[PDB]
Amino acid sequence: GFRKMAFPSGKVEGCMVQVTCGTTTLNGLWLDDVVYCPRHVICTSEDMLNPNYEDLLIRKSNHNFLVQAGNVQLRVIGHSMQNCVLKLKVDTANPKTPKYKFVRIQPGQTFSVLACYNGSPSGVYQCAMRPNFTIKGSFLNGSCGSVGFNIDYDCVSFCYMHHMELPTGVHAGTDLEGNFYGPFVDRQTAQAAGTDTTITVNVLAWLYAAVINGDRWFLNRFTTTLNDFNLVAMKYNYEPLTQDHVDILGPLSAQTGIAVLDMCASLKELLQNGMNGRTILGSALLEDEFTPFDVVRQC
Amino acid sequence: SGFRKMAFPSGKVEGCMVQVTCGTTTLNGLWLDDVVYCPRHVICTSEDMLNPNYEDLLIRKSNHNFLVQAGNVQLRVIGHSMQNCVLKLKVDTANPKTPKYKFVRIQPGQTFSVLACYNGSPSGVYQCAMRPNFTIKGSFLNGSCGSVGFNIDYDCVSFCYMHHMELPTGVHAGTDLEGNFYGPFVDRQTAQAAGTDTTITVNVLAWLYAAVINGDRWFLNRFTTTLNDFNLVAMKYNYEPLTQDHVDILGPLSAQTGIAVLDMCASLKELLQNGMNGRTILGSALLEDEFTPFDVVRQCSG
Ligand SMILES: *[C@H](O)[C@H](C[C@@H]1CCNC1=O)NC(=O)[C@H](CC(C)C)NC(=O)OC[C@H]1C[C@@H]1C1CCC(F)(F)CC1
């Protein structure tokens, strides 16, 4: 079978804490003796529209920050700001700290989101970084500071911290250095993203997944050149396919014995003609949030 | 749509996963207090798979034949018993990571999170719905048996599924944590067919309530129906009939929207009888049936 699968979240759950400043409560990430969280926690409703964060932060004391790990308050013994992330130093180190790194992911890559409220893990799901640097998440009030991550071996790579929702219902946030993905800003304003495109290499990986699991009504005898496929892809607001993408798809091509450019010809036919009421792996739409790696590992 | 399949955080279950080996056969087990629970077919050879005599296979087993490991650390087995299709292995250490837990038997239509594991190591977590024909659409490879499905309420893990097998159609079958299969299946390496599947009506209704909550309500009509009339129509479209429990679990969403359950049933009946006519609901022309009423409230209101 084939399913959208998140990484097991236990290593991250052990790091989630609650951070409160004033009447604002959200989540923080407690690694070693530092708690990371969105800096907009220091805002009031009057500050959010055009917050001078350096100004607002110098006017704060360590004791204006309440950090709770379950039933226990942690003492904040220092604070700093790195871009849009506030760093709170605490006197206790987290024994549950996993091996970890901070990474900045590329558009098209996927990661798992651990959605939390009041420092408590609530759900886990898989997201992709959209080409327009939004994510199609499920985040409600109080979810800020929830993080996204991947796990390689025993190492957790943190790639996302959650900051906001856009009026279209998609979401925006930063890496763990506090730099936004995309042209967004942590102020209380209605922000639009650039035109989104579909992640072509992922659609192809998903089509290969559908074949593996015995679904192949969409295949065809035709083939296409890389450039001719890319011309059609761009017309339909699909990302262009690179030779590295073709290479990355090799394993799935070998496994099924379907040349990448043959699958490209099937996708071209789908873009031009549609699905005709049919479905692929249950979906009436082409899915683009599975990477080739995601498909390989699970098949 | 604004919805996605969301699993429960898996950490409380990760802390309970172990591996159980007989000979060269390794599957996963669930370690709670001083008991490890796993599929009984761990005691099978390749040759026992066809039609195992589990009672006879077990009588030849001793505690010292079971290798239970948390990671690479052996857990000594001090007693063993069979309960339906599950083996219970008493071990000499109480799991310090045991959460508050209970064992529950879910109904078709209900959803749960699966922590897919191999050699006692978790690989991924995803949401499943129990189909009306008592299969799930999982993603399981060899060595996945003993992976469990669960829900988490407050601090309490309700274990509802343990994985045992794949069917020729590629769907999956298993037991509750008391070893009783969901559906008519048995743990033997034979060809077994699931009954024809049907659409989970209560979840489609939940989906329609979700659409209403988000302002998408063109499909609401001025009519109502009796539960019996709706069920008889529903069955002609390969939809499951509603139970009283289904009506009850739609209560919170009916109260949130002010739309009586039976009025929503009449709206669904009209969609079934007239089709969508090129319209969409929550962005789709397909009705979703794997979000329960609880799932909807989770993602709309938190
Ligand atoms: C943090 O928990 C919070 C998460 C949001 C809340 C709802 N769903 C989420 O993912 N983030 C925020 O509250 C931020 C805070 C700013 C300082 C960045 N703000 C928003 O995410 O607001 C969403 C905008 C679409 C809403 C609206 C804002 C006011 C307006 F500008 F007048 C009109 C548009």
Which token pair is A150? Answer: 């991947």
Q: Render the burial of A32-41: b for 16+ CB within 10 Å, e for the rest.
A: ebbbbbbbbb
- Could A125 and B286 be called an inter-chain contact, meaning their C-beta atoms sit closer than 8 Å? no
The widest CA-to-CA distance across chain B, in whole angstroms, is: 69
**Cβ atoms of residues A143 and A115 within 8 Å:** yes
**Cβ atoms of residues B136 and A1 within 8 Å:** no
Which token pair is B224? Answer: 């109502």
**Cβ atoms of residues A213 and A283 within 8 Å:** no
Q: Which residue has the tokens 């045992």?
A: B164
Q: What does this entry list as its resolution, in Å?
A: 1.6
**Cβ atoms of residues A44 and A64 within 8 Å:** no
Closest C-alpha among B158, B114, B109, B159 to residue B130 = B109
Among protein residues, the one whose CA lies closest to atom 20 of ligand 1:
A164
Partner residue facing A10 (CB), from B4, B7, B15: B15
> Which segments of chain B are extended strands (E)?
17-22, 25-32, 35-39, 67-70, 73-75, 77-83, 86-91, 100-103, 111-118, 121-129, 148-153, 156-166, 172-175
Distance CA A243, CA B228 (A): 59
Question: Is beta strand B77-83 parallel, antiparallel or unpaired with respect to A24-31?
Answer: unpaired
Q: Alpha carbon of B221 to those of A108, B172, B228, B268, B269: distances in Å? A: 42, 38, 19, 9, 10
Q: Alpha carbon of B103 to those of A274, B27, B41, B106: distances in Å? A: 46, 20, 21, 10
Distance CA A280, CA B4 (A): 17
Among protein residues, the one whose CA lies closest to atom 12 of ligand 1:
A164
The total number of residues shown for chain B amounts to 302
How crowded is residue A204: how many other Cβ atoms within 10 Å of its Cβ?
Answer: 28
Which token pair is B217? Answer: 């309500």
Q: Render the burial of B68-102: b for 16+ CB within 10 Å, e for the rest.
A: bbbeeeebebeebebeebbbbbebeeebebbbebe
Question: Is beta strand A72-74 parallel, antiparallel or unpaired with respect to A66-69?
Answer: antiparallel
Distance CA B128, CA B132 (A): 13
Three-class secondary structure of residue B100 per DSSP = strand
Closest C-alpha among B298, B301, B15, B18 to residue B153 = B298
Q: Give B65→chain A minimum CA distance, Å.
A: 31
Distance CA B166, CA B171 (A): 6
- Could A3 and B172 be called an inter-chain contact, meaning their C-beta atoms sit closer than 8 Å? no
Distance CA A29, CA B68 (A): 34
Q: Give A99→chain B minimum CA distance, Å.
A: 16
| Torsion, Cα of A202, A205, A207, A213 (10° steps) | -140
* B248 sits in which H/E element: helix B244-249
The total number of residues shown for chain A amounts to 299
* A232 sits in which H/E element: helix A226-235
**Cβ atoms of residues B193 and B173 within 8 Å:** no
Phi, psi of B228 (to 5 degrees): -65, -45
Please say if B41 is a catalytic residue: yes
